[PDB]
Amino acid sequence: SRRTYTLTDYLKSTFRVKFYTLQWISDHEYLYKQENNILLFNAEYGNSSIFLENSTFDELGYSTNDYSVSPDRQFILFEYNYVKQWRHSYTASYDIYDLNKRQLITEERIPNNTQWITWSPVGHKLAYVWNNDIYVKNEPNLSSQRITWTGKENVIYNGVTDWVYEEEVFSAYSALWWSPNGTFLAYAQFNDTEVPLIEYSFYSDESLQYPKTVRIPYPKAGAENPTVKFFVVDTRTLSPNASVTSYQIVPPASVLIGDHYLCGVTWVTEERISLQWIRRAQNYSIIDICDYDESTGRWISSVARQHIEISTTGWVGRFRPAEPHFTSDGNSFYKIISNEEGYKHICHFQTDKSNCTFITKGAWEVIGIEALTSDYLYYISNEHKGMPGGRNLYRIQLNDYTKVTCLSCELNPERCQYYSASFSNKAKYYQLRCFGPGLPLYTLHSSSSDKELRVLEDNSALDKMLQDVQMPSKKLDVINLHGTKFWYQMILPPHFDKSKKYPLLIEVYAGPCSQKVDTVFRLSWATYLASTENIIVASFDGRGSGYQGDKIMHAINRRLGTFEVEDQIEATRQFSKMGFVDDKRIAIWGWSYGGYVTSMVLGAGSGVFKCGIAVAPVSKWEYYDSVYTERYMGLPTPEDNLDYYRNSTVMSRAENFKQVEYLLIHGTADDNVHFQQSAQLSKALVDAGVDFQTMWYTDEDHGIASNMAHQHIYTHMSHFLKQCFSLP
Amino acid sequence: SRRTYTLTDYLKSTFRVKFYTLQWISDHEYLYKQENNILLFNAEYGNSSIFLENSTFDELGYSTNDYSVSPDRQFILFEYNYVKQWRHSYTASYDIYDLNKRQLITEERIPNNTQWITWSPVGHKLAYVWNNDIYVKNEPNLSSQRITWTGKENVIYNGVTDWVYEEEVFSAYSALWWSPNGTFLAYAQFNDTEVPLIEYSFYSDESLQYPKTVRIPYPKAGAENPTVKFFVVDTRTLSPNASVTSYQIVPPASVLIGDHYLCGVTWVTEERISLQWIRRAQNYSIIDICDYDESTGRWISSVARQHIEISTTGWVGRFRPAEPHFTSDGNSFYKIISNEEGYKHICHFQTDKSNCTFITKGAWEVIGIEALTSDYLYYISNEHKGMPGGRNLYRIQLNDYTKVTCLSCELNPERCQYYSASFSNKAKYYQLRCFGPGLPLYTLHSSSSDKELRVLEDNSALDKMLQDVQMPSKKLDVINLHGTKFWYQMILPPHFDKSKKYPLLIEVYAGPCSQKVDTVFRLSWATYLASTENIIVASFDGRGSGYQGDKIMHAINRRLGTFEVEDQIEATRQFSKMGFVDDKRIAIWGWSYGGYVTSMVLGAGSGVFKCGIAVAPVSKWEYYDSVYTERYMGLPTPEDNLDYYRNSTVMSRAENFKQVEYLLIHGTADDNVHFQQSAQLSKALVDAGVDFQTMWYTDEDHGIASNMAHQHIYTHMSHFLKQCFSLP
Ligand SMILES: *[C@@H]1O[C@H](CO)[C@@H](O[C@@H]2O[C@H](CO)[C@@H](O)[C@H](O)[C@H]2NC(C)=O)[C@H](O)[C@H]1NC(C)=O
Ligand SMILES: *[C@@H]1O[C@H](CO)[C@@H](O[C@@H]2O[C@H](CO)[C@@H](O)[C@H](O)[C@H]2NC(C)=O)[C@H](O)[C@H]1NC(C)=O
Ligand SMILES: *[C@@H]1O[C@H](CO)[C@@H](O[C@@H]2O[C@H](CO)[C@@H](O)[C@H](O)[C@H]2NC(C)=O)[C@H](O)[C@H]1NC(C)=O
Ligand SMILES: *[C@H]1O[C@H](CO)[C@@H](O[C@H]2O[C@H](CO)[C@@H](O)[C@H](O)[C@H]2NC(C)=O)[C@H](O)[C@H]1NC(C)=O
Ligand SMILES: NC(=O)[C@@H]1Cc2ccccc2CN1C(=O)C[C@H](N)Cc1ccccc1F
Ligand SMILES: NC(=O)[C@@H]1Cc2ccccc2CN1C(=O)C[C@H](N)Cc1ccccc1F
Ligand SMILES: *[C@@H]1O[C@H](CO)[C@@H](O)[C@H](O)[C@H]1NC(C)=O
Ligand SMILES: *[C@@H]1O[C@H](CO)[C@@H](O)[C@H](O)[C@H]1NC(C)=O
Ligand SMILES: *[C@@H]1O[C@H](CO)[C@@H](O)[C@H](O)[C@H]1NC(C)=O
Ligand SMILES: *[C@@H]1O[C@H](CO)[C@@H](O)[C@H](O)[C@H]1NC(C)=O
Ligand SMILES: *[C@@H]1O[C@H](CO)[C@@H](O)[C@H](O)[C@H]1NC(C)=O
Ligand SMILES: *[C@@H]1O[C@H](CO)[C@@H](O)[C@H](O)[C@H]1NC(C)=O
Ligand SMILES: *[C@@H]1O[C@H](CO)[C@@H](O)[C@H](O)[C@H]1NC(C)=O
Ligand SMILES: *[C@@H]1O[C@H](CO)[C@@H](O)[C@H](O)[C@H]1NC(C)=O
């Protein structure tokens, strides 16, 4: 008979996809967590030794969720008492374990509620953030040293990002940067004094008699932004009775004239640091390469070492300007910029010269630079087969730009089209990470021989379970939209027959620079909808989508909610034409940006879609943060782009919702897309006399990722989808 | 064929129910608003003089929502700029208009955002509350005198209630009482310093970038309560260069010892004030009659003038102890208290004596004392035909308690079973307000011979319209529960067919001291459901309900959510026996307490109910305010009633919601039963893995009373019910 992939199968994750997380600690060695044992593996041969046994964790008393070994391998840092804040930020407790005398350190411990901690890149020094201030510990058993004194809740952040820099700029909580040999500690300071607060109720545990108000400094579009300062601290002079030796690096004049962001930091040498700034407008970026002056302790900038990157058609980079990758000596660097054809490729910059040489070109894009030696450059691109939803590792010879070899293209062509890589310290070995379209495959390689050393994880146990089950098929193809090639995928039910008519669900994100259509293997909600419920789940990457050139990406510049929404409709019209698609039962669903598109599509009046589900959607762009919104939309002033802000709200299309069956879902504790967004939307539908369904989730944030809520939302969305599709 | 009463018919109020609101300003004259004209109607004859023409409103510029004429007929107050706050509270702008010179007052105006205003009982003195402080104007054209200096937003209230006193104690916003001749201005001061704030988001209009937080001093069960001070201000010495002359009256020792409330103020004479105090527990009440001392200015209490009223089984009175009604001389008063058998009846108290004499008796309850003369006492009761859901006017002779005449019973016995009354200044005339079971009929009567002088409004226009529509019928009957006869009502569809199986909707409130079964005529949502959708709507009054004696009422004392919930289930079980009720299609719905009962019924696991809707329900009693909750539940402490607080939450019954289809509705701006309640309820259901439906209403309070929100909720509830009842 054969069982199908059920909703319970996804929700409880009975079909476990395995992975291989390793941590490179040398040119040939890496650590790997195996049944809570830390094993030190050797790449050269394959032999492993016990670095830390599992019994060491058992005698700690607490459950350890993360560990971090010092580069000198003398000490390890144990992370416990994990408390999540935002997407990347969290607070935790930390213990240091001596590996020499196999004992715990109990004096001068890392304080509880620590916001960030990191080892220096050499030895066993520590830098940590507590109460918005930076502390440095030279020795694990010695007293720490306070570096900053300005730390203040919701106001001053030293060494860690505020809300907006975490989500939109750094994609991390950390704002600390040790110099390669630990001489210097660089950090950013964020000032949120003038940033307005978003407030919302957190109800907490049932026992809480009164709800509390969460207050976050969150700059909405056009609002007052956080200011930033950058300091380099000399850690050589750090001493109990000495002042902190620090130098403030200010941005170049062309950026200093207005509101700006610090978007990147790269340590070049011990005496050379690179800083990436961007204007508030985000179409003008500058790299400032600053040199340490030994006699004054200053970090000097010069116009010769300043490198401008602009965009005339839109914004710079994907979500941020691409990071510079410096040579060992630091006299030149390699960086992804847009070329003349509007395709993102690797350009070779000299540190004190303004012109660069492109080392890659074509109707495809370099995703990122992975590694660099004096002879080779390793990078990821979507060049292979001309499919942008694919990823491969490429190696280009530095002395001869023509010699470019693909190290992952032909290893497993059918099974593996989507690759990521992780290199050892001097790029002597690399782990390859296959993500699809077949079962994820983890392999280790040598860089000298290009040979596959061994299989680390092939997910054979997963293959054993999947042959028992009625798996759906994932087909990737292309269609024509307004004279432009655009990619799409379809999750097709098992025993797919083109005579029978199937209902259609459009799974959308369609955000700027994003990619919904790729060759990644995923056990998803759509997996169950095709397998058990026999629904076609299709996804489409139209205008505004990334990895296909500036032309396609910058198409929605200053006009969010237009082309990317219109293309979702037109592509579905094309899907509905196909004989196997029931035009009576067509739905659309999306998360966050996907929810906004879903809503805008459902407010279009296209008649194409019968129903849709929007989860935690943006409803009005003035409600979303400055960095993300202004990037694509500019400022919401009549002097700028207010007109396009006004006619891109979902509320402006409230009238057209009367035809469709709408499900609006939002978490009340959403710090990202605030509950306000769905609240104001629902109010405009109530006002318009539109009937629709709603679902709030108490104390859930943007991910609605708590176990029971995750279970509930998909259960509830399935019921709504089945009711709309008249499915038993 | 004939049309049915639609949902649009209810929501748009196409079938208008007329009424007759008049203002008694003498013992034989009253004012009435007709075509925007205020006419001085004479009860003695029937002739009406034009007091203020309709064109006078139009010259002012604004739209006027209320008027108030000074007792000497020299001035009129105009109320405009009405801004709602809580249930009774609002701010408004005010203009005084001279009737002599027919001119507006323009010098020294009543301030913007005035909280409360009142004329003195004689002459034309004005007292008002602005920014939490009291102001007295002796003359409308004269400058105002500040009475209090303590007024502070969310902290100190002079002359107006705080949240809890408005909702639960006074049932009004005003805390000001002029003395009969206007010599004294009495007021209460409320101090909310230690009362914890409820905070919730108000999103406001779409243009508001950041949501604001509303903060209300709201004491939840067992929390710190507002304190009260009572003052009497001698208004004779009020002068620009003079201090305020005031005396503070404190509660008697027996009440002073602990937490207490002021629940009633009654002016007896010019030198005699009556204060009603109640302990926090609300089972001990005292009446303090205080005498003005001319030589010192003090108001004196004496033990002989103190009248205790206690409850050993529950609480005192219904929601508060009944008010004392004093004779002209002030040496005696009549007050409704519980007699031997626990029925509420009028007792004749002497002012300086403890023992009282009951003037009424029987297995029925006096609803209220309306008027009193030297000869007669006029009151409202449910004596007639033994039905507690009926009201009638009765007159009892003060020299002979045998002579009691029913003045309303036999005027229209089949049309009028529910009555209200408004008496002239000396009780020489009265208006009789009939509310059912037939169309409302408003009449005028003399007290001399009790003759129907004329018909003021008889709803003839509505009667004409009702002939064209298929009206449902209202059946009132009795069922026996555990050896006690309780009353119930049923709204039956047009052309009732005994062969067909009709779906059943239970409309519940069930709050302590409440009544869902009455003879009141109501064009309602249930009207539509019977007429158009052919659904039987039933209501029932079980244990805990009022107007049937203390035994039934106090049945749920310290155990809310038990007996009243159990009686709803068992009564419905009895209704499902009837051959015309489809036991497979029974629903239950309710608002506030009705939402709580609905929820508690649905989670009872009775299997009797298929589905249900809870609108703005209490989910946990610790979340609700101190006064209401503690009255019935005591304190949520292990020493007191925590055990019954714990097991009476809806969240504890979460597991049983898997058997039912649940719809949970709450307004996000609910200041009464906070959104927290449904937020905590939904979270527990999510935790239990229960599927259910939800609907938040942005910025709506406890009444969800806005135009579009009102329309939307019933539309949404109608579609949910139809889907549950499998109705096309
Ligand atoms: C501690 O490490 C031991 C290895 O010494 C783990 O034992 C292994 O358990 C797996 C199943 O998870 C077996 O398949 C292996 O045969 C075991 N290894 C050997 C060689 O004994 C043990 O699981 C670890 N303990 C904890 C806390 O998980
Ligand atoms: C906001 O308004 C603009 C201008 O009126 C819209 O842009 C037009 O979109 C239609 C597509 O239906 C095109 O045919 C026109 O060429 C566009 N006009 C201009 C001036 O560019 C835009 O679509 C509106 N935004 C949304 C989200 O509805
Ligand atoms: C409202 O009540 C509070 C008590 O809760 C009063 O605050 C006190 O004021 C006195 C005299 O000024 C101070 O000595 C105390 O420190 C306060 N008590 C506490 C514990 O807070 C306040 O005075 C009252 N307000 C009014 C106008 O009556
Ligand atoms: C929770 O509190 C008590 C738990 O003992 C419940 O007890 C009462 O109700 C029972 C109904 O099954 C009766 O059989 C018991 O006689 C009665 N307890 C006594 C001895 O007084 C109570 O009903 C529960 N309340 C709620 C809201 O469910
Ligand atoms: N997650 C992403 O695709 C990108 C990646 C990235 C890269 C550099 C710096 C930050 C980020 C985070 N990314 C984002 O898209 C962040 C956005 N806030 C996600 C988002 C977009 C629209 C609406 C809601 C929302 F959360
Ligand atoms: N409206 C009512 O039935 C009573 C009447 C009354 C009498 C004296 C003083 C105040 C009041 C107001 N009444 C109330 O029941 C107030 C309650 N807070 C209403 C209520 C009860 C349960 C749950 C929610 C809710 F708003
Ligand atoms: C692996 O074996 C080699 C033998 O030459 C040894 O040098 C190396 O230390 C071993 N690796 C481990 C597990 O440390
Ligand atoms: C933060 O900025 C404010 C102005 O917005 C300024 O007054 C304050 O001094 C700054 N604090 C620091 C430590 O930079
Ligand atoms: C630093 O100063 C403190 C307090 O004055 C003193 O105890 C300590 O000895 C000093 N440390 C050094 C290294 O001189
Ligand atoms: C950068 O953005 C600003 C403000 O939106 C705009 O005026 C300017 O044209 C942009 N510059 C380029 C190179 O497009
Ligand atoms: C009302 O009209 C009657 C007519 O009989 C007249 O006697 C009386 O004066 C009038 N009263 C007023 C002033 O309204
Ligand atoms: C004002 O009153 C007159 C009669 O005095 C009446 O005809 C007119 O309709 C009224 N105007 C309105 C509607 O305000
Ligand atoms: C009250 O005092 C004011 C100002 O101090 C003064 O102008 C006025 O004359 C005084 N009023 C009387 C009645 O004396
Ligand atoms: C009223 O209730 C309180 C608190 O439970 C109690 O201490 C007191 O004895 C009660 N009074 C009466 C007369 O029942």
Swiss-Prot record, chains A, B:
State the EC number(s).
3.4.14.5
What PTM annotation applies here? Answer: The soluble form (Dipeptidyl peptidase 4 soluble form also named SDPP) derives from the membrane form (Dipeptidyl peptidase 4 membrane form also named MDPP) by proteolytic processing.
Disulfide topology: C347-C356, C406-C409, C416-C434, C611-C724
**UniProt record, GO biological process:** behavioral fear response; cell adhesion; endothelial cell migration; locomotory exploration behavior; negative regulation of extracellular matrix disassembly; negative regulation of neutrophil chemotaxis; positive regulation of cell population proliferation; proteolysis
Task: Give the subcellular location.
Answer: Cell membrane; Apical cell membrane; Cell projection, Invadopodium membrane; Cell projection, Lamellipodium membrane
* Enzymatic class: hydrolase
Where are the Extracellular topological domains?
1-728
Any GO CC annotation of this UniProt entry: lamellipodium membrane
Catalyzed reactions: Release of an N-terminal dipeptide, Xaa-Yaa-|-Zaa-, from a polypeptide, preferentially when Yaa is Pro, provided Zaa is neither Pro nor hydroxyproline
Q: Which UniProt keywords apply?
A: Aminopeptidase, Cell adhesion, Cell junction, Cell membrane, Cell projection, Disulfide bond, Glycoprotein, Hydrolase, Membrane, Protease, Secreted, Serine protease, Signal-anchor, Transmembrane, Transmembrane helix
Q: Which Pfam families match?
A: DPPIV_N, DPPIV_rep, Peptidase_S9
The active site is formed by: S592, D670, H702
Q: What is its main location?
A: membrane
Q: Which GO terms describe its molecular function?
A: aminopeptidase activity; chemorepellent activity; dipeptidyl-peptidase activity; protease binding; protein homodimerization activity; serine-type endopeptidase activity; signaling receptor binding; virus receptor activity
Q: Glycosylated residues?
A: N47, N54, N112, N141, N181, N191, N241, N283, N647
Q: Which Gene3D superfamilies match?
A: alpha/beta hydrolase, Dipeptidylpeptidase IV, N-terminal domain
Q: Which family does it belong to?
A: Belongs to the peptidase S9B family. DPPIV subfamily.
The protein, known as: Dipeptidyl peptidase 4
Species of origin reads Sus scrofa
